[PDB]
From a paper:
The fold of [name] consists of a β-trefoil, typical for this protein family. To conclude, the sequence and three-dimensional structure of [name] show extensive similarity to protease inhibitors of the Kunitz-type, although the inhibitory activity is weak (in the micromolar range). A number of its biological properties have been characterized, including delay in clot formation by impairing the intrinsic pathway of coagulation cascade. In addition, [name] was shown to exhibit anti-inflammatory, analgesic, insecticidal, and anti-tumor activities.
The three-dimensional structure of [name] was determined in two crystal forms. Both of them were in space group C2 and contained two molecules in the asymmetric unit, but the unit cell parameters and crystal packing were different. Further analysis of glycosylation by mass spectrometry and protein sequence determination has shown the presence of N-linked oligosaccharides at Asn27 and Asn57. However, it is not clear whether the dimer observed in both crystal forms of [name] is biologically significant. There is no particular need for dimerization of a protease inhibitor, since Kunitz-P type inhibitors form 1∶1 complexes with their target enzymes. Since we were not able to obtain crystals of [name] with a target protease such as trypsin, the location of the reactive loop may only be predicted. However, the observation that [name] is slowly cleaved by trypsin between serines 58 and 59, located on a loop that is involved in direct interaction with the active site residues in trypsin and other serine proteases, lends credence to this assumption. Thus the detailed structural basis of the inhibition mode by [name] still needs to be verified.
Author numbering:
A (entry chain B), B (entry chain A), C (entry chain B), D (entry chain A): 1 to 164
Write the structure that this text describes.
């Protein structure tokens, strides 16, 4: 059971290489962050930075699977003027959509879902909060060597583990 | 994509409780199986027994959506004299149509289709291989406590996991 | 130093999920194997089946990096009539090139190279034994849930470890 | 792809011995650095010190091949009064052209290009930002035992690793 409002790390189902907003990797003040990607921490594999899920249905203590929710990074340090809230933006250099921070709670572009996938989970992003949704996977194109979460063809199988 | 000929578990989109033909659940020799239902494994949830999809178009290597196919259970054990092939039968002791094994390849009553259902899928059954097709859902009436697949008004949203 | 004629396991740089020719996964006699893929062993991660490198330059005891070589599976069991030797074939369902067994030593399509990539290695496949080469990576398209090695855009970072 | 502004190690395509400006290798304050060479770290092999690429076209987010760019060392320590920017100087004590730091952004002598070299890459230097460009290779003459980058007839095949 995934709990509303409680911090979890998102990890690949088969690795301990977690994820962080880019601004937190760089760890310095930024004038702005027009495209703050969520990148994988790989050398060495590190747990990353937690997130919190907020179901569209405000009344729910347990996060429903396959239902609209918001995602935001849980971090007391933050080096962007923009929000911690996840969204999706278009990018030329990454040749399409990428997950980024700097969103807005309950906006049209803010909606993701957690869905079962094999014996674990996938994230999907749902434009306008409805189908058709797009799986969230790993991309490298335009990443210059790093891996970043993006709406993809192939979902990243993930699991959630409670933070600290 | 679902590949023709390859075994997949059928699973509810939000659950880990999969499905087995009753005869395999009982695991004992049967004199006949006039109504071998596909029952859900719930206590505890278990992935069940895989199936294989065979499109009506035998050229097809990838199973298409919204086209006639057969389904059969993938199991080396089999405790009924009848086949592993899925079909639909009427049962007054279940007040209506039920999914069962014991069908025949390419027969009038053997045709199902996989369709999109929101962010995932559903199975429908197509009498004589034509529309109207009816959604396959979960029933309980006359299951002696067990839940089993049956054509009904509301579909069961499902996902597919390649076996393993 | 990678030694000519000596068996190694190819592993991803950051996982213990190795690789096997499909025919060895199935472990039964096949009438033929028109497209025997090299698939990753993931549930649970397993070391896989070794390979042997044979440099184009027959005189060499140490495998040269960035030079033409052949690859063949090292296995006393074999369930295909075709060879253990790696090559690349076109596939419709996988939407392009895939690595397969069933090749021929020193043929035009038999040539791969091991090249340094970050702190480890990549495999590339070199049509006709010359540039331009294509990185070998992981693909899923048309794999029905499995991952298979294919000429790709993005290389799989790999390491080699001596077998048993 | 190499991204403008992002740090990468330059590494020989088949080796782990990378490169550092001499002043960083010595790690001691210098009164001037008339010829701060880029020397290879060999005993043992070490990845060295990253550089950043800046295309002459400042619009460009991805570094293109065969176009004028500047290179500079990425280091917070710096022991020369001169800059981190790469250039080429004549040195009669090295019998000819050598790569050095201490250049100036966008100057006549500051232009290098990344070109394809077989299955990998090479750096060339372009006097006045035009052809003919000369290959950058490794020399040793007058290096007091050390190997250093220098324009020459034979290129050093290189690869690039994003820093880390
Ligand atoms: C379900 O029914 C099967 C009946 O065919 C069982 O297989 C049989 O198991 C016997 C006792 O272990 C064995 O003497 C028989 O040879 C075998 N019959 C066949 C055709 O294989 C099966 O038992 C399981 O599998 C066997 C091979 C052992 O591993 C047992 O420990 C298992 O219980 C029955 N399975 C279950 C889970 O009840
Ligand atoms: C290379 O030169 C640097 C000279 O600036 C060294 O940094 C200096 O290290 C001193 C002794 O540790 C320290 O008191 C100084 O504050 C510091 N200077 C500056 C500007 O940072 C450096 O020494 C290494 O780094 C320091 C911070 C410590 O970690 C030492 O243990 C290191 O040796 C010299 N580095 C090497 C590898 O020689
Ligand atoms: C990162 O940034 C914060 C705030 O600027 C600083 O206090 C902290 O020490 C930094 N370094 C590391 C290694 O976390
Ligand atoms: C929230 O969820 C409950 C139970 O699933 C439901 O009864 C209620 O109507 C939902 N509220 C909204 C606003 O969707
Ligand atoms: C069956 O599928 C093949 C491959 O897509 C197609 O070309 C062929 O026309 C189809 N046959 C029928 C009867 O629909
Ligand atoms: C696989 O196949 C071989 C030869 O047919 C057989 O002898 C072996 O026991 C098989 N099973 C396993 C689990 O390796
Ligand atoms: C094999 O390699 C050696 C050293 O690299 C070389 O001298 C020799 O000419 C090579 N032979 C062939 C046939 O390429
Ligand atoms: C620089 O690159 C941009 C983006 O590709 C291009 O559109 C522009 O025309 C280029 N400018 C010059 C001077 O080449």
């Amino acid at each position: 059971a995934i709990l509303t409002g409680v911090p979890y790390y998102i990890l690949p189902s088969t690795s301990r290489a977690g994820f962080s907003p880019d601004n937190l990797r760089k760890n310095t003040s930024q004038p702005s962050c027009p495209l703050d990607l969520i990148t994988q921490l790989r050398f060495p594999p590190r747990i990353g930075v937690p997130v919190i899920f907020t179901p569209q249905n405000s009344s729910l203590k347990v996060v429903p699977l396959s239902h609209n929710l918001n995602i935001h990074t849980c971090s007391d340090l933050w080096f962007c003027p923009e929000s911690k809230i996840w969204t999706v933006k278009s990018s030329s250099i990454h040749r399409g959509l990428v997950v980024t921070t700097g969103g807005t709670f309950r906006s049209l572009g803010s909606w993701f879902r957690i869905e079962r996938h094999g014996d674990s989970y996938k994230l999907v992003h749902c434009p306008r909060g409805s189908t058709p949704c797009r799986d969230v996977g790993i991309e490298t194109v335009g990443g210059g060597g790093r891996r970043y979460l993006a709406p993809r063809d192939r979902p990243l199988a993930v699991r959630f583990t409670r933070a600290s």
